[PDB]
Amino acid sequence: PIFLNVLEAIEPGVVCAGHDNNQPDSFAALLSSLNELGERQLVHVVKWAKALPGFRNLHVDDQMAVIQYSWMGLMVFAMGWRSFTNVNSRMLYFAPDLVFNEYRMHKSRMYSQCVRMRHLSQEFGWLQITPQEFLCMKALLLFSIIPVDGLKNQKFFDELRMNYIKELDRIIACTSCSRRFYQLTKLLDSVQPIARELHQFTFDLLIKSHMVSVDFPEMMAEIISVQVPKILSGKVKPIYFHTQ
Amino acid sequence: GAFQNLFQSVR
Ligand SMILES: CN1C(=O)N(c2ccc(C#N)c(C(F)(F)F)c2)C(=O)[C@@]1(C)c1ccc(O)cc1
Numbered sequence A: 001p002i003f004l005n006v007l008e009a010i011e012p013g014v015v016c017a018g019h020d021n022n023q024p025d026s027f028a029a030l031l032s033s034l035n036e037l038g039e040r041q042l043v044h045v046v047k048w049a050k051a052l053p054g055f056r057n058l059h060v061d062d063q064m065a066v067i068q069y070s071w072m073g074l075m076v077f078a079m080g081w082r083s084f085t086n087v088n089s090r091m092l093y094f095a096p097d098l099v100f101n102e103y104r105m106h107k108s109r110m111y112s113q114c115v116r117m118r119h120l121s122q123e124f125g126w127l128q129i130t131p132q133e134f135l136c137m138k139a140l141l142l143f144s145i146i147p148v149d150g151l152k153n154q155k156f157f158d159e160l161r162m163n164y165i166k167e168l169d170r171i172i173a174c175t176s177c178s179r180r181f182y183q184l185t186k187l188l189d190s191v192q193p194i195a196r197e198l199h200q201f202t203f204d205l206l207i208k209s210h211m212v213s214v215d216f217p218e219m220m221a222e223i224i225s226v227q228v229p230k231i232l233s234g235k236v237k238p239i240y241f242h243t244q
Numbered sequence B: 001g002a003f004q005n006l007f008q009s010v011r
Helices: A002-010 A027-050 A060-087 A102-107 A111-126 A131-142 A154-173 A176-212 A218-232 B002-009
Strands: A092-095 A098-100 A145-147 A236-238
Touching (some): A002 A131, A027 A060, A027 A092, A027 A098, A027 A102, A027 B002, A060 A092, A060 A111, A060 A131, A060 A145, A060 A154, A060 A176, A060 A218, A060 B002, A092 A111, A098 A102, A102 A111, A111 A176, A131 A154, A131 A176, A176 A218, A218 A236
Antiparallel strands (some): A092 A098, A145 A236
């Protein structure tokens, strides 16, 4: 299992948010921590992605693009997995120091997004997703959202995404298999609408932020103002398996 | 940009 060997080897370790749990929850503190966590995870997505099989086949501009477009979906998927594996979906395990109960879901002003993410967490258990299926599905997620007008070297992308689909098929093969691929691609598709709702909520925050003084940190301000509106305006869209 | 700096800083 060469491919799985590699994905296990490069999988990033635990990441903390730096949140102060000794203080009562407030929207401002929760958002600062999500911003911090978000940036810390992005660093690890970059390290991870550059070490993926084939990733350097991509034009460097496309390498950079695909990470920024798919980072929120990658974080959603992984957070769902941690929630399932660490606490049986009873809460959302953003980080060991940032665990959301329903009161935090509410205080974050992202209650609906949180509920949908808790549902995603429960599906890992209903579907009995294996840790090896998780790793293959997460890698495929990186190659699941791109500009409608194409990437700089579309052909290299196409062949890379193909290989990751072949490798998910591989560990499903290794019929029932048909049913399995359906269930897993349905779950993957469901990540994208959730990421979009996170993007919409945060884009709106950023715009109003001069009165709400949400001091958006530099990396986040750049990605929310430069890259996220491409997704919100439809110029960048997920690659769905099934029709929505 | 910030993201490009970060991407380029990773081996
Ligand atoms: C509101 N946001 C949020 O929930 N986080 C966030 C941070 C870590 C995790 C984790 N793990 C998650 C996640 F779980 F939902 F995936 C969200 C973000 O990174 C943030 C800060 C954001 C930033 C930019 C953007 O375009 C959309 C959202």
